């Protein structure tokens, strides 16, 4: 998870949205990324 959080924050996403997307995604990074793309606000 720590590598996955770092990957996604390195891509510009914020800490709390990253952790929650990973939770919903059951730690699938590709799925978490798709969640962030579709649903992050702004």
The experimental technique used to determine this model is X-ray
Reported resolution, Å = 1.6
DSSP 36: H
Distance CA 14, CA 42 (A): 11
Domain total for the chain? 1
With vertex at residue 34, the alpha carbon angle to CA 5 and CA 25, rounded to the nearest 5 degrees, is 60
Residue 21 sits in which domain range?
Answer: 1-42
Distance CA 28, CA 41 (A): 21
What CATH number should be reported for the domain holding residue 29? 1.10.8.10
- Only one residue has tokens 């990324």, namely 33
């Amino acid at each position: 998870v720590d590598a996955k959080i770092a990957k996604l924050m390195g891509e510009g996403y914020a800490f709390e949205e990253v952790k929650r997307a990973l939770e919903i995604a059951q730690n699938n990074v590709e799925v978490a990324r798709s969640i962030l793309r579709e649903f992050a606000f702004p």
